[PDB]
Amino acid sequence: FLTAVSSIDTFLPVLNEAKLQWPTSALAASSEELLGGYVGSQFYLQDGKYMQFQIAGSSNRCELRQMIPDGGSEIGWAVDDGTTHTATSSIVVPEQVDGVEEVTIMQIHSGEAPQLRISWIRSKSLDGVAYEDFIMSTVRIGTGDSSDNFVKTHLADRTAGAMSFQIDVKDSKLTITVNGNVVVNGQDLSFWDGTDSCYFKAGAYNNNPTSESATARIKFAALAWVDHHH
């Protein structure tokens, strides 16, 4: 059998506060199933150390969704409760196979929409500038579909080695750190003031592939979801 992610200690904290959605938003595995050896080609322990997600097909996913810890239900939090909600990861994004065009690897999402997607992107122009094989943030500052509802930023070019991300939400401000460097510094999330259904996600959410059979693949060496408070 493939080795289960829960067979080592590294990911137990996040698995204790997550459900897995695969191959769609429908539930694949409860937190307890994840902690108790849930495994498949879509979600297994890779190289003895990575929590690896794999998925093919347009808008399909293999993605963790933040839950209340210790067998609780779906969590919802606000962007301005005075604490800092933090997601920290270390991700090896391999070269993506032909046909994979965008893979969302971390999110802040709510009942209505994604406040934030961090995604690998094969190629895109942002603000008149071309980028290739890179990591992008897409922040929603509204619920519409016109471009003024989004702020998109080049976070980093993809590296062969592990790349760390820290997503901090405090007092309606979003900070994204990559490999220890602040890239997005206090992006305003005030549009979401009043929303109490936000949560973190992470894994592989396959967006707009050119082939339905091409398999997105993303490896986490570390993932934690925490609330920092006094």
Side-chain angles (χ1 to χ4, degrees), residues 39 54 99 109 166 171 188 197 205:
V39 64
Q54 291 195 101
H109 207 289
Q166 195 179 124
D171 291 351
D188 194 6
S197 62
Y205 173 30

Side-chain angles (χ1 to χ4, degrees), residues 113-117 137-152 187-189 191-192:
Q115 290 65 46
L116 169 66
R117 296 187 303 104
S137 56
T138 301
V139 174
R140 271 187 169 280
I141 56 169
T143 52
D145 293 325
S146 68
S147 41
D148 56 52
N149 290 279
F150 307 88
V151 181
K152 305 169 133 299
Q187 162 72 53
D188 194 6
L189 296 179
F191 176 79
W192 302 104

Side-chain angles (χ1 to χ4, degrees), residues 11-174:
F11 305 99
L12 302 184
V14 71
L15 298 180
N16 183 54
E17 54 172 339
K19 64 179 174 177
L20 187 73
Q21 298 173 320
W22 169 81
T24 69
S25 61
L27 175 69
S30 70
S31 177
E32 299 95 335
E33 287 178 283
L34 293 169
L35 289 167
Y38 179 89
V39 64
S41 58
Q42 73 279 15
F43 181 79
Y44 71 92
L45 190 74
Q46 202 276 348
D47 295 354
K49 69 184 180 182
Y50 305 100
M51 172 171 64
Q52 181 182 267
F53 303 85
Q54 291 195 101
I55 186 66
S58 292
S59 297
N60 283 339
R61 69 190 75 217
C62 189
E63 198 176 28
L64 296 173
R65 189 286 202 214
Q66 189 185 1
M67 304 291 280
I68 292 170
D70 206 7
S73 57
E74 282 77 14
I75 202 165
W77 44 262
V79 302
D80 55 5
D81 62 23
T83 74
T84 302
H85 293 270
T86 301
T88 307
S89 66
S90 179
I91 308 181
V92 172
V93 182
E95 186 179 356
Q96 296 299 302
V97 304
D98 289 354
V100 181
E101 292 301 308
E102 176 173 11
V103 186
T104 292
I105 64 186
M106 302 175 81
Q107 308 198 54
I108 303 163
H109 207 289
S110 66
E112 290 297 301
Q115 290 65 46
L116 169 66
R117 296 187 303 104
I118 296 186
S119 318
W120 171 83
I121 301 284
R122 185 172 296 277
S123 74
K124 194 172 176 68
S125 181
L126 298 177
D127 200 9
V129 179
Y131 298 96
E132 302 272 359
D133 190 27
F134 74 103
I135 315 301
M136 185 169 74
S137 56
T138 301
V139 174
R140 271 187 169 280
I141 56 169
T143 52
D145 293 325
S146 68
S147 41
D148 56 52
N149 290 279
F150 307 88
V151 181
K152 305 169 133 299
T153 307
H154 172 270
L155 290 181
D157 291 342
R158 187 187 63 76
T159 58
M163 179 169 280
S164 69
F165 298 86
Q166 195 179 124
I167 301 172
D168 292 307
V169 178
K170 180 182 182 183
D171 291 351
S172 308
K173 308 302 176 246
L174 167 66

